[PDB]
């Protein structure tokens, strides 16, 4: 409960220097997919189909 009054103010007499972290993702892993090796790996008939 802030002690509100119509003629009262609160003024700081001191300070604190505060250091905080913020962690942000920037990139992810770059992946490539060979379709023929995934679906039809080392099979000629599957590649033709």
């Amino acid at each position: 409960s802030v002690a509100y009054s119509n003629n009262s103010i609160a003024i700081p007499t001191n300070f604190t220097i505060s250091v905080t972290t913020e962690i942000l993702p920037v990139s992810m892993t770059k992946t490539s997919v060979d379709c023929t090796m995934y679906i039809c790996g080392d099979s000629t008939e599957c590649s033709n189909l």
Binding site: S32, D34, T36, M37, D42
Partner: protein, 49 residues
Amino acid sequence: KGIYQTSNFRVQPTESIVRFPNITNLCPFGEVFNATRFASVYAWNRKRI
């Protein structure tokens, strides 16, 4: 101008091999398909090969 992905590095097979068990006898085709007596259908004969 640039850099382009392609198919992954394939190595082709050099020869073909066949590995079957050391089996010399022929299957009893004369005993199965040329038997003297055949069973009835209610008492059908089961033979292990």
